[PDB]
Amino acid sequence: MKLLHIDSSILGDNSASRQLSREVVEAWKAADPSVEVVYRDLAADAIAHFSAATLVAAGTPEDVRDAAQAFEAKLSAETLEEFLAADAVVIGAPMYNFTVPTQLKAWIDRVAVAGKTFRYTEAGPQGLCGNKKVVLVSTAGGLHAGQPTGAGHEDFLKVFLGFIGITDLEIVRAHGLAYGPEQRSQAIDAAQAQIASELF
Amino acid sequence: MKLLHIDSSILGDNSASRQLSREVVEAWKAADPSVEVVYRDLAADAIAHFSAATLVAAGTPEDVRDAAQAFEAKLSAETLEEFLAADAVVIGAPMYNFTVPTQLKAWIDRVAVAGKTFRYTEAGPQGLCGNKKVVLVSTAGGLHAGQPTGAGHEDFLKVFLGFIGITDLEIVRAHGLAYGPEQRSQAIDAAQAQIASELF
Ligand SMILES: Cc1cc2nc3c(=O)[nH]c(=O)nc-3n(C[C@H](O)[C@H](O)[C@H](O)COP(=O)(O)O)c2cc1C
Ligand SMILES: Cc1cc2nc3c(=O)[nH]c(=O)nc-3n(C[C@H](O)[C@H](O)[C@H](O)COP(=O)(O)O)c2cc1C
Ligand SMILES: O=C1c2ccccc2C(=O)c2cc(S(=O)(=O)O)ccc21
Ligand SMILES: O=C1c2ccccc2C(=O)c2cc(S(=O)(=O)O)ccc21
């Protein structure tokens, strides 16, 4: 199986989602020694904003593209192909200003591709990624899951993942991390117990 | 009064939100000839992803910053100061992949600043932007306001704007734009009637 491990935190060694996403992957490798892991750090190697230039490049034949358009088209193709090849995806998803990092949304914009990860039908849109397993690693300073404040974060992610057809989704959450050291530690400990005894 | 006009569509002349945001501003200038308009096209002049480097630069004294850190700090300061100075903000907000463009979120990340547009208190967080009037120009190919699919779009924006204390918010919406020419035209016409007879 191919597992794509994505991180999007900008907090480096202080990141809760980087710690828990690595822990999920390590547990996964221990459960399935044959898994092949591909890593993509969307904060360290940020994907360009999906732009007018991205669209023009996609509509320009390869042999006619200039260097900037070749970069956009290759970025689009490599990101999409890596996701299409993955059978499982572990996604580190901080909440920054009430939604996911732009580094993560910029990746979503390269993997939401008509004819590839969903299709338009005469009957409506349909997701094409039903075979892929996703583990979302959801981290936030506050506790706002299931409340309106959470809309841009987990609720959005569930919308997007549902649209491209993900049915097998697990959420490893550590929230309330900004409320103090004890609260942060317990939320991480609870997430670790989930990883240890509820994921595999 | 200072009006900040922000666009974030990547669709140029084909953009619904650029057309309606300009229409809001033109109507506003006609209602109040003394208004002073500042324009910021977040797609044409994109703001860098809010990154680890953005945070390091903010924590580095000016006289110690290298060129990249000076760029991050100036980007942060100019964007925040332009928003602090604005008394009214008109924001073009497409829905791309179930949320706002990363170009718009990258601006949100530069204007959500503790001590400036909200503060942490011993009693909790409090918005500081209650005097500012906002008109959100909300455009989408589908019709999903008030439904879960809409979470990352208007619901998120309302969360963010509420957090920084905006109380005077109007939403000019044109949705269902992808359902065909007639449906697109009526949705734009309805938005124009709102601008003409319900905003000023
Ligand atoms: C720029 C920035 C914005 C943040 N905005 C929010 C927010 O809107 N709501 C919230 O609950 N926590 C917010 N937080 C706290 C983060 O969600 C918390 O630190 C979480 O651990 C981030 O995941 P990470 O440690 O993997 O980076 C923010 C943190 C940063 C650095
Ligand atoms: C890259 C891209 C992604 C889009 N994703 C969505 C979407 O998730 N949901 C939707 O209803 N419309 C979607 N649309 C349609 C836009 O919301 C619609 O075209 C709207 O007019 C965009 O505002 P604009 O014309 O000002 O750019 C998308 C359009 C583009 C170009
Ligand atoms: O901006 C925030 C932030 C920035 C940097 C570190 C931590 C936070 C944070 O915990 C937070 C919580 C919340 S709340 O909605 O849980 O009150 C809102 C905003 C932030
Ligand atoms: O990706 C979409 C897109 C991309 C480019 C142009 C238009 C659309 C669109 O209308 C849309 C609608 C919807 S729906 O949720 O209203 O069915 C979902 C996705 C898209």
Curated annotation (Swiss-Prot), chains A, B:
Q: How is the cofactor bound?
A: Binds 1 FMN per subunit.
Top-rank lineage group of the source organism: Bacteria
Q: What class of enzyme is it?
A: oxidoreductase
Alphabetically, the GO molecular function entries are: electron transfer activity; FMN binding; oxidoreductase activity, acting on NAD(P)H as acceptor; oxidoreductase activity, acting on NAD(P)H, quinone or similar compound as acceptor
Tell me the InterPro entries matching this sequence: Flavodoxin_fold (IPR003680), Flavoprotein-like_sf (IPR029039), FMN-dep_NADH:Q_OxRdtase_AzoR1 (IPR050104), NADH:quinone_OxRdtase_FMN_depd (IPR023048)
Keywords attached to this Swiss-Prot or TrEMBL record, sorted alphabetically, are: Flavoprotein, FMN, NAD, Oxidoreductase
UniProt keyword Flavoprotein, yes or no? yes
* Residues reported in the UniProt entry to bind FMN: S9, S15, A16, S17, M95, Y96, N97, F98, T139, A140, G141, G142
User: Which cofactor names does the annotation list?
Assistant: FMN
Question: Which reaction is this enzyme known to catalyze?
Answer: 2 a quinone + NADH + H(+) = 2 a 1,4-benzosemiquinone + NAD(+); N,N-dimethyl-1,4-phenylenediamine + anthranilate + 2 NAD(+) = 2-(4-dimethylaminophenyl)diazenylbenzoate + 2 NADH + 2 H(+)
Kindly name one Pfam family recorded for this protein: Flavodoxin_2
| EC numbers on record | 1.6.5.-, 1.7.1.17
Describe its assembly: Homodimer.
Query: Which protein family is it in?
Result: Belongs to the azoreductase type 1 family.
State the HAMAP family in the record: Azoreductase_type1 (MF_01216)
Q: What is this protein's function?
A: Quinone reductase that provides resistance to thiol-specific stress caused by electrophilic quinones. Also exhibits azoreductase activity. Catalyzes the reductive cleavage of the azo bond in aromatic azo compounds to the corresponding amines.
Please report the name of this protein according to its UniProt entry. Answer: FMN-dependent NADH:quinone oxidoreductase 1
Give the source species: Pseudomonas putida (strain ATCC 47054 / DSM 6125 / CFBP 8728 / NCIMB 11950 / KT2440)
